[PDB]
């Protein structure tokens, strides 16, 4: 399940730090340098975080137009997926 | 120009102020998981632009006012701000660049940018596809009359045709009266009335009775002439508007249907044409035949086509129709939901080959094969603790293909 993959990557990054930047999560999930990340990979991850947020597992903050997306953990992140 | 953003306020699933941002993107897809509010995007767009297809229920409810504003940058490019508000009693307020106006003045501002509510040349609902794929030939004629402007002459056309019909039989009736009067004159003169009046005021009765029959006929003649000329003028204008639209769509449909049915296996695509069903001197009184055959198919009836093939033929017709009066932007409902992967790819290719200055695309997309090819994305998610929909953006032009 795609959401399961993303759920695991976020629990790792958000277990130490309170927030992680989407583009950092995307480099981790793509297993490559950011210069090589493809539109298909970026869209898959973007949709995955929207799913996790609608399920109540993460929080999303973006304060600038096309700006960095900040992700924080919710309690349900460590109980679902 | 183009839309650079929509701003919402307490609209349906959105609590407070939110932004649907497009920026300088000419191909934006709006996406999100089910029950996130994505479906409310169509609603907000068609609301702020004035589509009628309950008004109190659009306001957010926790379970009080709401508005939607379209921000549009013309070719100059100056800013246009089109705001529609739902007030506390359920009525609509209209504002243009932050000044109150009435509904008519609102539409006119939109028409000036070729955003035509009468033709809905800027938006394809999902229901439009079903409606197109099941419509009768006479329904298609009426649709072309609607988008072409010729339908606004229909009632005047039919009123004046009736006047011609009446004034015609009135002329024939008064002509037969005059033929009987002049026939009674020949009989009354062979009566040798000169002798009778020499050894009579009735001779003056025939004087004014014949003078009356003449004046009455000449009036029926001039009235029929006026009705015939009024009717022919309206008929000519109705035909002019209709033929201009029909000619455009008939020419385009062949090309658009190919583009949407070309594949690696069948690089020639299918074949489509439009035609007036029956022979007539007044095309808008006949039905319009739309025939489309995918590659390597050829039967007379289209109802033997698959649901996918019917959908793609309907989309081709909708594109061909809306190209007659090109909108600066174009909003496409979530049609990729029901389509197989091959057809989703063809929609994607068609959009990328047209999305740019002069035709901005805003697409509701369920299928990654489509929305992963956008210039930018609008993601809609549900904040359950706050009980509201929210939006995120991602510029996909930063990332590479392959």
From Swiss-Prot, chain A:
Post-translational modification: Cleaved by ESP1 at the onset of anaphase.
Primary role: Cleavable component of the cohesin complex involved in chromosome cohesion during cell cycle. The cohesin complex is required for the cohesion of sister chromatids after DNA replication. The cohesin complex apparently forms a large proteinaceous ring within which sister chromatids can be trapped. At metaphase-anaphase transition, this protein is cleaved by ESP1 and dissociates from chromatin, allowing sister chromatids to segregate.
Superkingdom to which the source organism belongs: Eukaryota
Gene name in the database record: MCD1
Assembly with partners or alone: Interacts directly with IRR1/SCC3 in cohesin complex. Cohesin complexes are composed of the SMC1 and SMC3 heterodimer attached via their hinge domain, MCD1/SCC1 which link them, and IRR1, which interacts with MCD1. The cohesin complex also interacts with SCC2, which is required for its association with chromosomes.
Protein name: Sister chromatid cohesion protein 1
Family according to the record: Belongs to the rad21 family.
Residues of the full protein shown: 483 to 563 of 566
Compartments (UniProt record): Nucleus; Chromosome; Chromosome, Centromere
UniProt comment concerning the protein's domains: The C-terminal part associates with the head of SMC1, while the N-terminal part binds to the head of SMC3.
Note: Present with 1040 molecules/cell in log phase SD medium.
């Amino acid at each position: 399940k795609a959401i399961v993959q993303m759920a695991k990557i976020l629990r790792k990054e958000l277990s130490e730090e309170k927030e992680v930047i989407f583009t950092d999560v995307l480099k981790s999930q793509a297993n490559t340098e950011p210069e090589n990340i493809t539109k298909r990979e970026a869209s898959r991850g973007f949709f995955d975080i929207l799913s996790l947020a609608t399920e109540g597992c993460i929080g999303l903050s973006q304060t600038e137009a096309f700006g960095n997306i900040k992700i924080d953990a919710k309690p349900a992140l460590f109980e679902r997926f | 120009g183009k839309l650079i953003r929509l701003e919402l306020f307490n609209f349906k699933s959105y609590k407070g102020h939110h932004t649907l941002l497009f920026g300088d993107s000419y191909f934006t897809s709006i996406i999100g998981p089910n029950g996130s509010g994505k479906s409310n995007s169509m609603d907000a767009i068609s609301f702020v632009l004035g589509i009628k297809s309950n008004l109190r229920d659009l306001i957010y409810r926790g379970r009080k006012t709401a508005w939607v504003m379209a921000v549009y940058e013309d070719d100059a490019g100056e800013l246009h701000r089109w705001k529609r508000t739902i007030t506390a009693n359920g009525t609509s307020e209209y504002r243009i660049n932050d000044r109150v106006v009435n509904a008519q003045q609102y539409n006119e501002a939109l028409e000036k940018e070729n955003i035509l509510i009468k033709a809905r040349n800027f938006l394809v609902f999902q229901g439009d596809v079903e409606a197109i794929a099941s419509q009768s030939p006479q329904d298609l004629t009426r649709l072309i009359e609607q988008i072409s402007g010729s339908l606004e002459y229909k009632e005047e056309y039919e009123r004046l045709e009736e006047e011609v019909r009446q004034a015609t039989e009135e002329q024939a009736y008064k002509l037969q009266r005059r033929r009987a009067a002049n026939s009674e004159i020949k009989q009354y003169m062979e009566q040798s009335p000169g002798l009778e009046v020499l050894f009579m005021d009735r001779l003056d009765h025939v004087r004014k009775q014949l003078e009356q029959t003449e004046q009455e006929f000449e009036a029926s003649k001039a009235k029929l002439r006026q009705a015939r000329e009024s009717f022919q003028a309206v008929k000519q204008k109705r035909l002019e508007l209709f033929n201009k639209a029909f000619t455009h769509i008939q020419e385009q449909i062949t090309h658009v249907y190919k583009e949407l049915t070309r594949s690696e296996a069948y690089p020639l695509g299918g074949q489509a044409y439009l035609d007036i069903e029956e022979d007539t001197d007044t095309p808008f009184l006949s039905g319009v035949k739309y025939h489309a055959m995918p590659p390597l198919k050829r039967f007379r009836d289209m109802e033997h086509l698959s649901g996918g093939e019917k959908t793609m033929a309907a989309l081709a017709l909708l594109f061909a129709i809306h190209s007659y009066q090109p909108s600066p932007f174009f909003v496409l409902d979530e049609v990729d939901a029901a389509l197989d992967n091959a057809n989703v790819e063809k929609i994607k290719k068609y959009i990328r080959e047209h999305a740019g200055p002069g035709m901005q695309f805003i697409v509701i997309s369920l299928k990654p094969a489509l929305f992963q090819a956008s210039e930018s994305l609008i993601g809609v998610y549900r904040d359950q603790e706050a009980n509201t929909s929210r939006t995120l953006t991602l510029d996909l032009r930063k990332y590479r293909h392959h």
